[PDB]
Design a protein around this ligand. Sequence first.
Ligand SMILES: O=c1[nH]cnc2c([C@@H]3N[C@H](CO)[C@@H](O)[C@H]3O)c[nH]c12
Ligand SMILES: O=c1[nH]cnc2c([C@@H]3N[C@H](CO)[C@@H](O)[C@H]3O)c[nH]c12
Ligand SMILES: O=c1[nH]cnc2c([C@@H]3N[C@H](CO)[C@@H](O)[C@H]3O)c[nH]c12
Lengths: 288, 288, 288
Amino acid sequence: ENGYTYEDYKNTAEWLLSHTKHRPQVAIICGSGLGGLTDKLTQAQIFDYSEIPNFPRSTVPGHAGRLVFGFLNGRACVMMQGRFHMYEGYPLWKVTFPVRVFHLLGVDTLVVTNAAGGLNPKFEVGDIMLIRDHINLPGFSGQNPLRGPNDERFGDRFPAMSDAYDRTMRQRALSTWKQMGEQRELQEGTYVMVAGPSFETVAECRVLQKLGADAVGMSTVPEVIVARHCGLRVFGFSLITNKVIMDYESLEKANHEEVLAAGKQAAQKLEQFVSILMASIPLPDKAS
Amino acid sequence: ENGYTYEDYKNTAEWLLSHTKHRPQVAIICGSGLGGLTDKLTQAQIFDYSEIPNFPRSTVPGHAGRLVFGFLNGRACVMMQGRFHMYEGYPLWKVTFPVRVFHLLGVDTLVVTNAAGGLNPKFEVGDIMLIRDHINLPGFSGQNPLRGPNDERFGDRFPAMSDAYDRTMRQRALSTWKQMGEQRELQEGTYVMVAGPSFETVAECRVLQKLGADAVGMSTVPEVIVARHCGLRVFGFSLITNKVIMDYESLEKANHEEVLAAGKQAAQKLEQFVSILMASIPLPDKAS
Amino acid sequence: ENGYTYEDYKNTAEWLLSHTKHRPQVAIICGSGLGGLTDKLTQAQIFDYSEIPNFPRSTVPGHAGRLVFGFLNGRACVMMQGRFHMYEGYPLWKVTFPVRVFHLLGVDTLVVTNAAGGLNPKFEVGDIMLIRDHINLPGFSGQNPLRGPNDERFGDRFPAMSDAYDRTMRQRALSTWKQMGEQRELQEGTYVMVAGPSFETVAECRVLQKLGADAVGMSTVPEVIVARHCGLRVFGFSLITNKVIMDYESLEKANHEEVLAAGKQAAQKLEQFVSILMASIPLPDKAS
Ligand SMILES: O=c1[nH]cnc2c([C@@H]3N[C@H](CO)[C@@H](O)[C@H]3O)c[nH]c12
Ligand SMILES: O=c1[nH]cnc2c([C@@H]3N[C@H](CO)[C@@H](O)[C@H]3O)c[nH]c12
Ligand SMILES: O=c1[nH]cnc2c([C@@H]3N[C@H](CO)[C@@H](O)[C@H]3O)c[nH]c12
């Protein structure tokens, strides 16, 4: 939590607000290859992290990392193209800083997307997995973005996470997928967050799946945790980029280079699905 | 380990000693809702962390956190009302600082108490679980209070922990419980330490139980580790405050608010049990 | 990764090179009790960490920790007698610093040796386990030596580790062992890295084996990770020093003191095996 003071977040939200006529309701954190979602915004207004007052800049990828305000399928959004990861060096209170400010911007929902490895055998690369749960490996050890002294202005000391991924939004999504006439089913599973940048060995791959994880990635979990601490409605997707877990013959490993496809149709389909799902995010106007 | 120098601990123990006529033999670290145990001390002398020379102050809860010297059922004690946790921001060498000083005070036994979630289905909220073992999740990753350069004046480089929770004291306790005429049995199990302040998701809850943990909490393990490194006799209890692990329907989750009961009878019963157990802690006077 | 700049490593390799006529091809990191391997070098040239420009000094054991250049069974080597461990306080980018410099020295292979606990029941103390895989517990949580901003000059952002331990070198080794006429077989397994200096409890011992680890230690994994990031050929051995995992009666625990044997025949045999294996490390001269 530390590093930043409540006023820090307030000065950043206040600056954004005074700089964009936009008042975001939905915050979207695009995983790798999912940045083109920003292409769908109307009335887009871009802010390079760089420009925003206390916003962590990108460790190299700034030339990808930006904040885009606009409208997506009826919702006022703010998208984070190029999220921060623990592995780049950002302590978790920098990684999740955007979230805390989105909260002060007025954002009430956060849709997190990521590129993950398929641990569930059922999964196929290209698959989209609705996140129904997560295992926060960094959090178990101390790397919980909430670590440090708690600010009741954002939330409780011990926020529950057993209900992090909105059930309703997960039902809607599933329904949206069905009604889309999408044949291949919307997969659902537990995302296990792993830190380090290096990729998993077959042995680690096996602990991850025996732990009950369906997809492994290096992000999402921190942002979710602080979003939920904030009280935001959270739900997200995982784009399965590679498959993992076998030393029967572990030579080629379909290594994430499938990021070429992240600049392809699967990514595109997730972006579309996410865009259609805006219609399922309750308007703050009671929309009932 | 670092942050503090051996002389730091010595200056703190020396100050306490020169400030209390008391010479503690037993150190008791009260978990949440177990602070009323201090109410049982005779000849109580209170020290707010604040007042003690190198003692970490509380991140907000100072208004709960204090050190009380006194006598409990025949033993000269020093109780820590309101222990420190990793999640509040304290590096582990601050969390476990008290222990190192209790050691220099002359303390030879440490009874650790905590409020934990029931992972073992057998457990019921209100249950008291004698800690027979622990899984130090933060320790596996690097968060071991002993990390840093070792002081042979406190202990070895590689202290064993396979025998952390005194078997004798665990037998006595079990016997004390039986002889107390207590019907509901004294549960015994492995306490899994988890760091982060946010609560466990059903998926994490499942890794914890498949890992063989019976109770999950966010403390105890560090203090135990350094107590044992010090050579102190350690044994402890876990007050089961909530139950955990099911998404069959994971809406209400009996969230720790059962801390109301921590200001209730279950807490009270653990406090009493702990007090009766003083009679089972060998006097340094050879007491044979 | 941070703490050091690319130029740091370059200034250290450059200094070593300008200080030793030696041009190492093989780097050997000796685990505990395996330092006598340095006794096998011809044309040995010793450098105390202390003397090398940006080289982390030892937290106490400097009086053991040194870098020895020489020739071992046909290969130009550089040995690290007394490696660094997370538990001594070294952040992982100090622990693995040697590796990055060995790389700039021209080293293309790294043989890592360690002393580990036997989790696989098949193992017997004294046994040598060829590392076929690893589970990086510290890495899952954030302690990955690669954490921080990536230097493409050393390697990729997301290096794969599924193929860390050279299969060929693991075949050769196995063959070398067979041809040595060694009766007791060369064990092979997954090494699980655990951080903290304190030893495992029976409960932790059980999570480690249910996780599929065969041997537990507190090193190797970081060095391997950065070696592989560097592109070096990595393979290694684990000398089983103690056995672990049972509370049926967990009193004496064959605690690592078997390090007496680390100054004995088992250690000696690993040192010999490692020395014979030099003949199996491809010469850079295309050696075909
Ligand atoms: O197999 C995998 N393990 C861990 N992370 C990833 C990813 C995620 N996608 C991004 C590109 O690989 C990267 O930031 C990482 O978090 C794809 N496949 C895997
Ligand atoms: O389900 C649980 N998971 C992790 N910790 C706790 C606790 C412990 N009790 C205190 C109040 O919930 C808090 O400091 C935490 O360490 C009670 N229930 C749980
Ligand atoms: O049972 C064990 N658990 C963890 N490490 C070790 C070791 C390793 N050997 C060294 C001496 O015990 C020490 O640095 C540690 O990493 C031997 N046995 C065990």
